[PDB]
Amino acid sequence: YDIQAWKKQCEELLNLIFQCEDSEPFRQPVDLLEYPDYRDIIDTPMDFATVRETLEAGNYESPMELCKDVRLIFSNSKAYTPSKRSRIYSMSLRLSAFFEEHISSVLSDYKSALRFHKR
Ligand SMILES: COc1ccc2nc(NC(=O)C3CC3)sc2c1
């Protein structure tokens, strides 16, 4: 029932994501010189370095907020892809499956700890 445990769990999951070759396109903000129309489609850019920096600055209050930003990385990829068969989008789908598989226990444990705190 540790209310704070999610933070280090998220740090470790981000470390695993950075070791995945599938995270390459998502490690830093999308390069606007490479994709000049990116901001005409995507209103809120997001990337894993921004997520890691937000976490390390103490600017996430819960793992749900971190999960919302990670999911935005994947929805941006889906919105920007010209095809569902594109390389970068295909990498985003595998990385999303990996992330969802690992974040589920983090969210469950945190929500359970909060419920215990308010019992
Ligand atoms: C910024 O995130 C994405 C997501 C999907 C994505 N699909 C792409 N496709 C191409 O470049 C084709 C050779 C023409 S570039 C790209 C970039």
Side-chain angles (χ1 to χ4, degrees), residues 1-7 9-119:
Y1 305 123
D2 182 340
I3 299 160
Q4 284 92 48
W6 65 276
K7 183 171 181 179
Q9 289 161 2
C10 286
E11 288 167 359
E12 292 304 328
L13 177 53
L14 286 165
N15 286 340
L16 293 172
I17 289 169
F18 273 86
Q19 287 299 309
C20 292
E21 289 178 6
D22 286 339
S23 70
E24 172 65 48
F26 312 109
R27 292 173 193 163
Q28 298 290 328
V30 171
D31 187 307
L32 308 180
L33 300 171
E34 294 168 6
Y35 305 104
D37 61 342
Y38 194 71
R39 299 297 309 277
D40 304 332
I41 297 115
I42 302 303
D43 297 325
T44 309
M46 191 50 59
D47 66 277
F48 286 108
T50 298
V51 172
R52 182 181 265 161
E53 286 158 5
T54 300
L55 184 68
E56 292 9 292
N59 289 354
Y60 285 127
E61 189 179 6
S62 71
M64 294 83 78
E65 292 177 348
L66 177 143
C67 188
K68 180 175 155 175
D69 284 349
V70 170
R71 287 167 175 178
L72 178 60
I73 298 171
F74 305 134
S75 60
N76 284 350
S77 181
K78 190 172 187 174
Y80 192 71
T81 198
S83 168
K84 294 194 177 188
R85 302 173 72 252
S86 143
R87 184 77 202 276
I88 292 168
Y89 175 64
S90 75
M91 292 166 81
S92 88
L93 295 179
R94 293 190 295 259
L95 197 64
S96 172
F98 176 81
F99 174 74
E100 292 298 329
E101 174 178 293
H102 285 71
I103 207 62
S104 54
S105 55
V106 179
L107 295 166
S108 294
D109 289 0
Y110 174 81
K111 295 178 172 189
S112 161
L114 268 191
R115 286 192 297 267
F116 190 78
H117 191 70
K118 309 167 196 303
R119 75 199 182 275

